[PDB]
C-alpha cells in the first residue's frame, strides 16, 4: 500500500488522457507522512526539489488530502 501513494505522488507531479487517470485512481482508492517518500518520488527528477516544494505548499493551504490537489490540479 505504501507503493500506491508513491506512484500517486510521482504521477501527480508528472502531470503539471489525463481525465482517465483521475477516475482510475479515484476508483482504485475505494509532516513525517510525506517526508518518508521524498527521495523515491523525486529520484533523478529534474528540478525535483522545487516540484516537491510546490506540492507541500498546496498540502499546507488545504489545512486523502492529496486527492483534493488533483481536483485543484484539474482546475486548469
Amino acid at each position: 500500500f505504501d507503493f500506491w501513494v508513491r506512484k500517486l505522488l510521482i504521477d501527480t507531479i508528472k502531470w503539471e488522457c489525463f481525465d482517465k487517470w483521475v477516475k482510475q485512481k479515484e476508483d482504485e482508492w475505494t509532516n513525517d507522512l510525506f517526508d518518508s517518500f521524498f527521495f523515491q518520488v523525486i529520484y533523478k527528477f529534474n528540478e525535483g526539489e522545487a516540484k516537491w516544494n510546490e506540492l507541500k505548499e498546496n498540502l499546507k493551504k488545504q489545512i486523502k488530502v492529496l486527492f483534493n490537489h488533483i481536483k485543484e490540479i484539474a482546475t486548469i
Partner: antibody
Amino acid sequence: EVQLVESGGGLAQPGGSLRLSCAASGFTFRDHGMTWVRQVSGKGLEWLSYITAGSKMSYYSDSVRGRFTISRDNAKNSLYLQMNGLTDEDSAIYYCVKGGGNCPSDTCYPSGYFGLDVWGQGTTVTVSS
Amino acid sequence: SELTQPPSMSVSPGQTAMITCSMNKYSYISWYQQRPGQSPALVIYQDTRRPSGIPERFSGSNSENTAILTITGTRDLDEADYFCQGWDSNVKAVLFGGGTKLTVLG
C-alpha cells in the same frame, strides 16, 4: 548515543595516498546514507562524497573526482574514503557525517531537505614532503 | 550555482540576527552552527524545521531565492560560524555557503 569515530588520518606525501575509516555506532548503519566533509583550519566546509545505503550510488565533488573513492561495509558499521593523488590543498580535518532522513532503494542524497544530522569529531590529514 | 552568505555579522544581545543565503535556483536549505573547536551541528533543515534540542529562538525561511536563518534574542552562546547548505541537481553536488561569523557585541 550515536557515535562516528574516524581514524586513518596522519601524514602523506604529495602525490601519495591515504585511506580513512569510520566506525559507526548508535543507530542502524544500513538504514541511512553516509558522507565525508572536510575543513581546512580557519576556512569553510567542503563536501567530498556520499554513498547510498546499499552502496549502489555515489556522488562526488568535482574537486575529488577520479582521485577519491567512497565505500562502505555494513557488516562492520564502517565507512571508507580512499584518497589518491594527495596535494597540499587536501590537508584538512576530515569529518564522517550521517546523512539525515532515510534511504529506500538507494535513492537518498545529501539534500537540504534532511541535511546532515550527525558529525564526527573528525581526523586531521596532512600532506607534506 | 553558488550559495552566497555575508562573511561576518554583528548583533547586540537580545537583538534579532538574520543571516541571509542567496542562490540562483531553488534548493532546500539546511543550516549548521560551528562553535569554536567543534564539529558543525545541524540547526535547521527542510528550510524551516529544527531538530529536537535546538532552542525555539532559531528559525528559518526560504523565498524568492533567499534563505534566512533568524535568531531572536541572541545570547553569548550563539556566537559561532553558520553555514547554509543546498543541492545542485544538474551536477549532483552539495552546495555550502562560505560561512558567517556571528559576533555578539558588548
